[PDB]
Amino acid sequence: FVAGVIRRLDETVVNRIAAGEVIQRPANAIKEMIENCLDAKSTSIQVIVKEGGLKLIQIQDNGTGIRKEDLDIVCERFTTSKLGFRGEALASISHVAHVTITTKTADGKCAYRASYSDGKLKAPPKPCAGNQGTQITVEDLFYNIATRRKALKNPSEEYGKILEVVGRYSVHNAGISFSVKKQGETVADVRTLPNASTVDNIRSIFGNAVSRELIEIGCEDKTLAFKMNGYISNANYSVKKCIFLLFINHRLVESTSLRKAIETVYAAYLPKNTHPFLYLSLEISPESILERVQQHIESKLLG
Amino acid sequence: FVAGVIRRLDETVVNRIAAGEVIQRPANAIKEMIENCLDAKSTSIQVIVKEGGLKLIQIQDNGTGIRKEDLDIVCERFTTSKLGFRGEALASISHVAHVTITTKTADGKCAYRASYSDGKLKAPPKPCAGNQGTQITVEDLFYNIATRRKALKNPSEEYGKILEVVGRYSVHNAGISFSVKKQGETVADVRTLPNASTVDNIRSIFGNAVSRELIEIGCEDKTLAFKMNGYISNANYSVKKCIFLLFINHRLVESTSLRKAIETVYAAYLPKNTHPFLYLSLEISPESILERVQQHIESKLLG
Ligand SMILES: Nc1ncnc2c1ncn2[C@@H]1O[C@H](COP(=O)(O)OP(=O)(O)O)[C@@H](O)[C@H]1O
Ligand SMILES: Nc1ncnc2c1ncn2[C@@H]1O[C@H](COP(=O)(O)OP(=O)(O)O)[C@@H](O)[C@H]1O
Ligand SMILES: [Mg+2]
Ligand SMILES: [Mg+2]
């Protein structure tokens, strides 16, 4: 038994593998990029996809853009214009894809384009055509981690997941226009419009049969420091699988705990196989609160 | 609406906060350090604690030690002598505590002592007294993150958690001697001995009433690529709360899924309130396997 010798991991490998762990699949890259479009005050967001996002993801917005002088560092880890940690999403994407950014600010004379590998600027940004806002292009996702590339689903399931994410951000963000299409196709698979209510976007993404059966919900509680709004299906609507959109502080989230609560409430009113449609937006800042929601929904179902 | 300006996070803050997130509490620092003692082929491990591990944790082993020339980088991130990622545990601890290491290799002429802040060597290592192996001393845990220091439990609950961890590693590692005491006390609260069987260490840590009621278990399956051994309580033993030790590849782990399976099996044999004692060691390399364990245990309870 002798002592080992300590070496350093190659963190070009470490950083690639961790970035794979964060991103996971094209829908998730797209989720991060959309959130950036919304943070940059965009009112029009367009998504274009080739091969389920494995070949190309392109997202164009009309938001505030990235200043020319900041393109040097925008994809580095822990660089952010905002107050896990801020500044990891584009850095991560850039470690497992070829990223190009085309962007213009109101105060810039023209748009600039820059390309990145592993978080680093490849060359000085170059002026190009383009209007107010930002187009990010993400190519060959996981070209450098074979195991995750093969561990992804077929192109049409991955496209399916992108639709789910974008359609879901579009219900939460009524008034902002969203679209998703496959590259080289002219007709969008999802398209919402700048003057749409929350209910119109539910009708558009989820169909007239759900939109006709919605109950509006809201409750605030200053003592429990939370607010909630959204829409739920009344006791007359039933499908084979529960469609549950959940947003907590404007991020889309999954929650086995709360979907359980609400299912128990609905179990008493809906048929044996069948399930509800749920859209809830919770505003919280940093337990018994999940009683008030179960209570509030049951109250609304009884009414 | 104008464009932001991108700045860099201070990663002295980032690194401190993430390290808090990993470590969480003294029992967990101790878990990481013990595992290092075992990796370094230690047969005698001594733990000493002041104030539940908030003031001092000291762990002495007789393992292979750290070479003098490697003390410079041992607490840096991603430095390891081994093949999330390797090399994060001591780096993390050193970002939220004052770490001192005293260590000797068989080939070194004497032990060397070094002190670290934020992963960096404070001064050149200095020769000192000490035998084969390594003593790590971890002081003032979370002195630099007030919110986690107050979010820790009272000193005696945290000490309680250290006992749990060490007692549990000691059942898995029969033949290796472990002890834990409070600083300045002469009698250990936990002590296992170099010639002890697994059953002796269960008797010692968990008492004669459990050790008298154990069924040995083992199953291998080449097709499902797993092995399992351990000990369980037979249908005659019952306590108010389920004591379940689980090791997968020699790390202690919690598992709501498998503890559920086994509880369902035991529910049929044990009284209404009461629960079993379980020690299982699973060897796996990188679903239907949880059926074989539920099956194998029921089989052993029926027999
Ligand atoms: N669509 C966009 N429009 C304007 N700025 C963007 C856009 N996407 C990214 N950015 C800029 O790049 C930075 C890094 O983004 P990201 O890596 O997601 O970290 P974060 O959003 O936490 O700051 C943002 O703070 C922002 O300044
Ligand atoms: N008790 C110990 N005895 C010998 N070497 C140790 C001990 N603790 C830590 N080390 C050394 O420091 C390195 C860093 O430990 P750690 O930060 O836990 O990362 P890892 O265990 O993944 O290598 C180990 O690879 C090992 O060489
Ligand atoms: Mg972002
Ligand atoms: Mg370790």
Numbering used by the authors:
A (entry chain A), B (entry chain A): 3 to 85, 98 to 300, 320 to 336
Q: Mind quoting what the paper says about this structure?
A:
Human MLH1 (hMLH1) is a 756-amino-acid, 84 kDa protein that can be roughly divided into two halves: an N-terminal domain (NTD), where the ATPase activity resides, and a C-terminal domain (CTD), which is the site of dimerization with MLH1 paralogs. MLH1 homologs are conserved across all domains of life and are essential components of MMR. In higher eukaryotes, the MLH1 and PMS2 (postmeotic segregation increased 2) paralogs form a heterodimeric complex, MutLα. Once a lesion has been identified and isolated by the MutS mismatch-recognition complex, MutLα is recruited and, via its C-terminal endonuclease activity, generates nicks in the heteroduplex 3′ and 5′ to the mismatch that facilitate excision and replicative repair.
In this report, we present the X-ray crystal structure of a ternary Mg–ADP complex of the human MLH1 NTD domain determined to 2.30 Å resolution, which is the first report of a human MLH1 structure. Crystals of the hMLH1 NTD formed in space group P64 with one molecule in the asymmetric unit. The crystallized hMLH1 construct contained residues 1–340 of the full-length protein. The crystallographic model included amino-acid residues 3–85, 98–299 and 320–336. The ATPase domain (residues 25–207) contains the noncanonical, ATPase Bergerat fold, the core of which is composed of a four-stranded, antiparallel β-sheet (β1–β3 and β5) and three α-helices (αB–αD). In addition to the similarity observed in the overall structure between hLN40 and the MutL structure, we also observed the presence of an hLN40 crystallographic dimer similar to that observed in the E. coli MutL–Mg–ADP complex. However, in contrast to the prokaryotic structure, the hLN40 ATP-binding loop is partially disordered, possibly owing to crystal packing. Gly98 and Gly101 are positioned adjacent to the pyrophos­phate moiety of the bound ADP, permitting the close approach of ADP to the N-terminus of helix αD.
